[PDB]
């Protein structure tokens, strides 16, 4: 109630306070509890191999230098008071570009407690790297992590833990990625050893499963229909040289236009994807179909019936092996 | 243990400290040891001729003004104390855009030692220029360097060396470029002379080898199959004017669509790449194949047999010369 009394209490706390020294300097390491409330996962980029995450990052720790008596309330102070207090040097090891929202002010919260407990909240948008195994693309499952670590303080000076155990991270169900579904999330606590010493580590990982529905309609269906369309040449009479030859190449031309456009959406990985094998496989079938008429024309100037039996069978065999291998 | 005792020691060190004056001002040059821990090489851009590097940049030097006694510990201070200390004016000569990560704080470390040794660490993401010789593209090998130099202090005032010799740079094995493989890295120390004097220089260079697997499947295979597909016209009977003419142009059309799309991914270099020679070479073969039927049609209203022998042979000769020249 008495603002002057509160003002004197706060001024006393900051009087002689050294931001350069951590709480319990020279003593036991200070335990910092962290909880994350996920706001959204805006983007998942295969070309850049990273994802963008927006979250409410909160840290809990005790600073005896900030303990106050006589005020039975939790003091919610202006975010500018954080510049006069010690905060953990928490950083994200796998991030590529991060910032703190500053509209209309810095999205920062400082809440003190009578025993010296400090609640420090930040709203952070971060772009974190996530190496992706695209061998089974687009039927792949990805494990994107967020590594949380202290930059300068070793385990002798600071310690991290998930406040609330497995409930430390909330809002995962709110994530709505158009291309991915959040299968599971995990919380991991461990110690990482470097040349400068051992540092505490907290890891938040998401298992992402790509949605196959878009690629089935956009890519597989046009390729299947063109391959079936190439088999129409077998029904056509052998004397229709203009018709059958035009059918073979235009199907080949159709495959090229589909093949060129599809591969523009992905990075230059040297290994064979599931989509890569399918596009090239279809391009071979239409290529062989046109070759099939070449042998026909040369011999006549039987093979057709053999091809009519084999080509649908081989393509069905190719699909059966393909889908079993990746599903 | 005694925070007040530590506070007095630190305040004494910064009392009268002049950041404008380097250690041992007017005396022997201060030796600065540097070690780099690579975090990742995010991108390698041929169009922009640059690469993006994320690393932990650390500097080691001795400042007798910061020597303290009575405290047998290495003081890890808040990163904001770096603003009150002298640091080398280290800059990257070949960088295009660099920044220091600042989430949740500036990724900066200051660690003092009783003898005055200062450890100064920064997490830096830098985009450094790398001129690329694309004559042998995409079978080329690139040497991308990172030039480290003092901006204002000459060799009379400061000196750089790799702390740890050939082990000064770590984490190279962690680099996972989808398009490149890290063949080797080298550390070079030398002195560079300018109009304003001679300056110390440290160079970190990576030899990158482009992965050929992606381009073989995406580019070479479609071109080879189309060129083989053009030879199908030779099997076709000469009276099938509609069939053979349609075959020639559609193969030419297919080459144009492939050729236009491929060249969009590269800068406008005036010299002939390996891929450039191959695409134009294939476009000539399909062009000559259609010309081959023109002479046939005119004469008949033998050449076919000669072409059936020559065209596969010439294309095989073209491939044999091409691959031997670049591999």
């Amino acid at each position: 109630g008495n603002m002057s009394f509160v003002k004197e209490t706060v001024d006393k706390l900051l009087k002689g306070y050294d931001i350069r020294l951590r709480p319990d300097f020279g003593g036991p390491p200070v335990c910092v509890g962290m909880n994350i409330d996920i706001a959204s996962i805006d983007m998942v980029s295969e070309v850049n191999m990273d994802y963008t995450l927006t979250m409410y990052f909160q840290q809990y720790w005790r600073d005896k230098r900030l303990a106050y008596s006589g005020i039975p309330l939790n003091l919610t102070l202006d975010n500018r008071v954080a510049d006069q207090l010690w905060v953990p040097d928490t950083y994200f090891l796998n991030d590529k570009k991060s910032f703190v929202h500053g509209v209309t002010v810095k999205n920062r919260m400082i809440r003190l407690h009578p025993d010296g407990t400090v609640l420090y909240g930040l709203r952070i948008t971060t772009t974190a790297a996530c190496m992706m195994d695209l061998r089974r693309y687009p039927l792949d499952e990805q494990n994107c992590t967020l590594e949380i670590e202290s930059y300068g303080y070793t385990t002798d000076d600071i310690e991290f833990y998930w406040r609330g155990g497995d409930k430390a991270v909330t809002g995962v169900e709110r994530i709505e990625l158009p291309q991915f579904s959040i299968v599971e999330h995990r919380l991991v606590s461990r110690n990482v050893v470097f040349a400068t010493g051992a540092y505490p580590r907290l890891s938040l990982s998401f298992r992402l499963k790509r949605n196959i529905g878009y690629f089935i309609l956009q890519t597989y269906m046009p390729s299947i229909l063109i391959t079936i369309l190439s088999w129409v040449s077998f029904w056509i009479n052998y004397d229709a040289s203009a018709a059958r030859v035009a059918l073979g190449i235009t199907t080949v031309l159709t495959m090229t236009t589909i093949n060129t456009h599809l591969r523009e959406t992905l990075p230059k990985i040297p290994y064979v994807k599931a989509i890569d094998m399918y596009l090239m496989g279809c391009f071979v079938f239409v290529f062989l179909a046109l070759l099939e008429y070449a042998f026909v024309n040369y011999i006549f100037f039987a093979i057709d019936r053999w091809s009519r039996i084999v080509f649908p069978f081989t393509f069905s065999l190719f699909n059966l092996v393909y889908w079993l291998y990746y599903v | 243990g005694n925070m007040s005792f530590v506070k007095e020691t630190v305040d004494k060190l910064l009392k009268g400290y002049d950041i404008r004056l380097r250690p041992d001002f007017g005396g022997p040059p201060v030796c600065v040891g540097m070690n780099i821990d690579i975090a990742s090489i995010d991108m390698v851009s041929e169009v922009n001729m640059d690469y993006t590097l994320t690393m932990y940049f650390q500097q080691y030097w001795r400042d007798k003004r910061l020597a303290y006694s009575g405290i047998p510990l290495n003081l890890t201070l808040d990163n904001r104390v770096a603003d009150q200390l002298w640091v080398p004016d280290t800059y990257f000569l070949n960088d295009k855009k660099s920044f220091v990560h600042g989430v949740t704080v500036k990724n900066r470390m200051i660690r003092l030692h009783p003898d005055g040794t200062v450890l100064y660490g920064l997490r830096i993401t830098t985009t450094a220029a790398c001129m690329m010789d694309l004559r042998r593209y995409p079978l080329d090998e690139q040497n991308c360097t990172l030039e480290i130099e003092s901006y204002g202090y000459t060799t009379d005032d400061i000196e750089f060396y790799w702390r740890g010799g050939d082990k000064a740079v770590t984490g190279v094995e962690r680099i996972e470029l989808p398009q490149f493989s890290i063949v080797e890295h080298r550390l070079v120390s030398r002195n560079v002379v300018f109009a304003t004097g001679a300056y110390p220089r440290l160079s970190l260079s990576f030899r990158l080898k482009r992965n050929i697997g992606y381009f073989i499947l995406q580019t070479y295979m479609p071109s080879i199959l189309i060129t083989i597909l053009s030879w199908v016209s030779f099997w076709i009977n000469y009276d099938a004017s509609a069939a053979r003419v349609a075959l020639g142009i559609t193969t030419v059309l297919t080459m144009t669509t492939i050729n236009t799309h491929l060249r969009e991914t590269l800068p406008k270099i005036p010299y002939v790449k390996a891929i450039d020679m191959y695409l134009m070479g294939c476009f000539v073969f399909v062009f000559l194949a259609l010309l081959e039927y023109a002479f046939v049609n005119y004469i008949f209203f033998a050449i076919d047999r000669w072409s059936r022998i020559v065209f596969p042979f010439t294309f095989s000769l073209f491939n044999l010369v091409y691959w031997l020249y670049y591999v």
Epitope: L93, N94, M131, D133, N143, T145, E147, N191, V192, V193, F194, A195, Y199, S203 | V172, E173, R174, I175, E176, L177, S181, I182
Partner: nanobody, 121 residues
């Protein structure tokens, strides 16, 4: 989950090739390190290689004598040991390391370990 089995280590007095087979989510653990534990001594680092890329790193004691190669298609890491010395009598282990597990030289940073072959020279 990654399962590691190493084989190819026998008793000799010589060139040896130790192979470490991997299975599971090997992509999440791209770095493979070789460790040996002499009796009465802590486990010692030998060499750490990456599944992808192929860049290598070796200890000073076994530099230019032990070479390691890997192939993702075979999903196996091969350690070739040449010019064997009596100090190389230890249980050789194969370990997998996470992408952001930190330093290579520290066995604690490694999560999945092999059984360990006993080699005496």
């Amino acid at each position: 989950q990654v399962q590691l089995v190493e084989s190819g280590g026998g008793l000799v007095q010589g060139s040896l090739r130790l192979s470490c087979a991997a299975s599971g989510h090997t992509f999440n653990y791209p770095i493979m390190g070789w460790f040996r534990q002499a009796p009465g001594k802590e486990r010692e680092f030998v060499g750490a290689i990456s599944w992808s890329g192929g860049s290598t790193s070796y200890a000073d004691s076994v530099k230019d004598r032990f070479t390691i190669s890997r192939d993702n298609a075979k999903n196996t890491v091969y350690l070739e040991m040449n010019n064997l010395k009596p100090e190389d009598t230890a249980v050789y282990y194969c370990a997998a390391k996470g992408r952001y597990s930190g330093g290579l030289y520290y066995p604690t940073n490694y999560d999945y370990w092999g059984q360990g072959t006993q080699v005496t020279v």
